[PDB]
Amino acid sequence: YYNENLDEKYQLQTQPYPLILELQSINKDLGDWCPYLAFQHNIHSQFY
């Protein structure tokens, strides 16, 4: 959040956003689900 007319110490205030929890609340309202239990691999890198 940005707002002028303040004491110069609060003109830029940062607040987190728990997107995962909001998405899970929406999904509980809706009722979708993941088709697989798990998907594992061993690609621990990006450039081989």
Binding site: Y36, L37, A38, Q40
Partner: protein, 50 residues
């Protein structure tokens, strides 16, 4: 006589003796419940069990 290798009692031993760099290992096999893990546990390359 004196027994050196026997098929006696098994299981864990009570007491261990170590001498300058020797080691030992144990294996714990855990049998989990029916639905302990859900699909939210698969976040990356391995499911976290902690």
């Amino acid at each position: 006589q004196k027994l050196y290798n026997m098929s006696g009692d098994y299981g864990i031993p009570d007491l261990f003796f170590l001498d300058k760099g020797n080691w030992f290992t144990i294996t714990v096999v855990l049998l989990s419940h029916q639905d302990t893990f859900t699909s939210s546990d698969s976040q990356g390359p391995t499911i976290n069990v902690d």
